[PDB]
Write an enzyme that holds these catalytic residues in place. Structure first.
Site, PDB file in Angstrom:
ATOM      1  N   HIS A   1       0.823  -1.226   0.000  1.00 30.44           N
ATOM      2  CA  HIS A   1       0.000   0.000   0.000  1.00 30.44           C
ATOM      3  C   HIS A   1       0.843   1.256   0.000  1.00 30.44           C
ATOM      4  CE1 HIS A   1      -0.053  -0.023   4.607  1.00 30.44           C
ATOM      5  NE2 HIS A   1      -0.182  -1.318   4.402  1.00 30.44           N
TER       6      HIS A   1
ATOM      7  N   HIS B   1       6.465   6.905   5.984  1.00 25.44           N
ATOM      8  CA  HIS B   1       5.983   6.498   4.671  1.00 25.44           C
ATOM      9  C   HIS B   1       5.264   7.708   4.081  1.00 25.44           C
ATOM     10  CE1 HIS B   1       2.566   5.903   7.366  1.00 25.44           C
ATOM     11  NE2 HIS B   1       1.857   6.357   6.346  1.00 25.44           N
TER      12      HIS B   1
ATOM     13  N   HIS C   1       2.020   9.093   1.129  1.00 21.37           N
ATOM     14  CA  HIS C   1       0.805   8.858   0.357  1.00 21.37           C
ATOM     15  C   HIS C   1       0.976   9.816  -0.810  1.00 21.37           C
ATOM     16  CE1 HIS C   1      -1.180   6.784   3.761  1.00 21.37           C
ATOM     17  NE2 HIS C   1      -0.399   7.575   4.472  1.00 21.37           N
TER      18      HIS C   1
ATOM     19  N   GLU D   1      -3.448  13.339   2.087  1.00 20.15           N
ATOM     20  CA  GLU D   1      -4.594  12.848   2.854  1.00 20.15           C
ATOM     21  C   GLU D   1      -5.240  14.059   3.535  1.00 20.15           C
ATOM     22  OE1 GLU D   1      -3.147   9.283   4.990  1.00 20.15           O
ATOM     23  OE2 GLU D   1      -4.273   8.412   3.301  1.00 20.15           O
TER      24      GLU D   1
ATOM     25  N   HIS E   1       4.311  10.814   6.458  1.00 17.27           N
ATOM     26  CA  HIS E   1       3.866  10.524   7.812  1.00 17.27           C
ATOM     27  C   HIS E   1       5.039   9.921   8.557  1.00 17.27           C
ATOM     28  CE1 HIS E   1      -0.561  10.208   6.454  1.00 17.27           C
ATOM     29  NE2 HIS E   1      -0.166  11.478   6.667  1.00 17.27           N
TER      30      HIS E   1
ATOM     31  N   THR F   1      -4.862   6.242   9.011  1.00 18.67           N
ATOM     32  CA  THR F   1      -5.627   6.480   7.791  1.00 18.67           C
ATOM     33  C   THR F   1      -5.731   5.243   6.908  1.00 18.67           C
ATOM     34  OG1 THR F   1      -3.775   7.218   6.459  1.00 18.67           O
ATOM     35  CG2 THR F   1      -4.927   8.902   7.785  1.00 18.67           C
TER      36      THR F   1
HETATM   37  O1  LIG Z   1       0.481  -0.107  11.302  1.00 19.56           O
HETATM   38  C1  LIG Z   1      -0.586  -0.109  10.688  1.00 19.56           C
HETATM   39  N1  LIG Z   1      -1.276  -1.252  10.481  1.00 19.56           N
HETATM   40  C2  LIG Z   1      -0.788  -2.549  10.940  1.00 19.56           C
HETATM   41  C3  LIG Z   1      -0.845  -2.777  12.435  1.00 19.56           C
HETATM   42  C4  LIG Z   1       0.284  -3.208  13.125  1.00 19.56           C
HETATM   43  C5  LIG Z   1       0.241  -3.437  14.494  1.00 19.56           C
HETATM   44  C6  LIG Z   1      -0.934  -3.237  15.194  1.00 19.56           C
HETATM   45  C7  LIG Z   1      -2.065  -2.809  14.523  1.00 19.56           C
HETATM   46  C8  LIG Z   1      -2.021  -2.581  13.154  1.00 19.56           C
HETATM   47  N2  LIG Z   1      -1.150   1.012  10.113  1.00 19.56           N
HETATM   48  C9  LIG Z   1      -0.678   2.350  10.200  1.00 19.56           C
HETATM   49  C10 LIG Z   1       0.363   2.615  11.087  1.00 19.56           C
HETATM   50  C11 LIG Z   1       0.838   3.901  11.227  1.00 19.56           C
HETATM   51  C12 LIG Z   1       0.282   4.936  10.482  1.00 19.56           C
HETATM   52  C13 LIG Z   1      -0.757   4.733   9.559  1.00 19.56           C
HETATM   53  C14 LIG Z   1      -1.231   3.404   9.440  1.00 19.56           C
HETATM   54  B1  LIG Z   1      -1.117   6.183   8.871  1.00 19.56           B
HETATM   55  O2  LIG Z   1      -2.182   6.972   9.507  1.00 19.56           O
HETATM   56  O3  LIG Z   1      -1.263   6.283   7.403  1.00 19.56           O
HETATM   57  O4  LIG Z   1       0.162   6.823   9.238  1.00 19.56           O
HETATM   58  C15 LIG Z   1       0.631   6.380  10.494  1.00 19.56           C
HETATM   59 ZN   LIG Z   2       0.157   7.381   6.381  1.00 22.25          ZN
END
Ligand SMILES: O=C(NCc1ccccc1)Nc1ccc2c(c1)[B-](O)(O)OC2
Ligand SMILES: [Zn+2]
Length: 256
Positions: free
Chosen positions: A61, A91, A93, A103, A116, A195
């Protein structure tokens, strides 16, 4: 599973992640005339001099540049935050066209991309525990506009060929994230969420007012990445952004 296509994009996420229609979802449009200056907001403290980057990963993604967060090496504090938040990854977007990609929006204006820098609250011990808390993460958001090249971003652009497809990773040590910060640290802040699914409402968002500029050649390379895995039909990784969500019962505060 979820994605950014017509059949599995943002408008579909609520079916598997009902929190998508929650009370503190992100991103949001930042109405600059309605945000209120908060004189009590402390200056932001970004301490990245000891940052230890490790790897860059195409996760299907976006691409994440990961850091060693097993010690307080690169941390964010101050501003609206109580406590110490450790940098774990950053990362972006971005869009298929320079007129879209961010975003968050500012007075409905969309930027070409949005960075981010993700940090988790050390009082929770690990990232997985932190995302289960309302003050578990602090994400520093930085807008990108297309214009002059950003020298500090070139090392990232040059390694993208090595992680073209989903699941590919490459060593990425000694990268200094300070090279991605604008001159000013003036910001807007509000309580929100991740997000991308699981869309957990665990983020204190700190969005910088000053964008950084990147060149058209640099963002073009982002658009050459693939959402698919190797050997699968090619789907360019573009428009991996979620649109603005209802602000609901929240106020955006300005540090300036
Ligand atoms: O880490 C993510 N998912 C997998 C997960 C791993 C461990 C526990 C729960 C979930 N997602 C995620 C993490 C950080 C950010 C976003 C999305 B964002 O808002 O785009 O920017 C900041
Ligand atoms: Zn992000």
């Amino acid at each position: 599973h979820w994605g950014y296509g017509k059949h599995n994009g943002p408008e579909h996420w609520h079916k598997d992640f009902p929190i998508a229609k929650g009370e503190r979802q992100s991103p949001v449009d930042i109405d600059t005339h309605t945000a209120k200056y908060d004189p009590s907001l402390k200056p932001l403290s970004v301490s990245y001099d000891q940052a230890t980057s490790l790897r860059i990963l195409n996760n299907g993604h976006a691409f994440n540049v990961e850091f060693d967060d097993s010690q307080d090496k690169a941390v964010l504090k101050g501003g609206p935050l109580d406590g110490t938040y450790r940098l774990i990854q950053f990362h972006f977007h971005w869009g298929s066209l320079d007129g879209q990609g961010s975003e968050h929006t500012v007075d409905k204006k969309k930027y070409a991309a949005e960075l981010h820098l993700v940090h988790w609250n050390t009082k929770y011990g690990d990232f997985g525990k932190a995302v289960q808390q309302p003050d578990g993460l602090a994400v520093l958001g930085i807008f990108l506009k297309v214009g002059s090249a950003k020298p500090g971003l070139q090392k990232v652009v040059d390694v993208l060929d090595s992680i073209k497809t989903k699941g590919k990773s490459a060593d990425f040590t000694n990268f200094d994230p300070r090279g991605l910060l604008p001159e000013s640290l003036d910001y807007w802040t509000y309580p929100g969420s991740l997000t991308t699914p699981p869309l957990l409402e665990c983020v204190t968002w700190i969005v910088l007012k000053e964008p950084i500029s990147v060149s058209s050649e640099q963002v073009l390379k982002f658009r050459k990445l693939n959402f698919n895995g190797e050997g699968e039909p090619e789907e360019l990784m573009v428009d991996n952004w979620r649109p603005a969500q209802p602000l609901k019962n929240r106020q955006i505060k300005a540090s300036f």
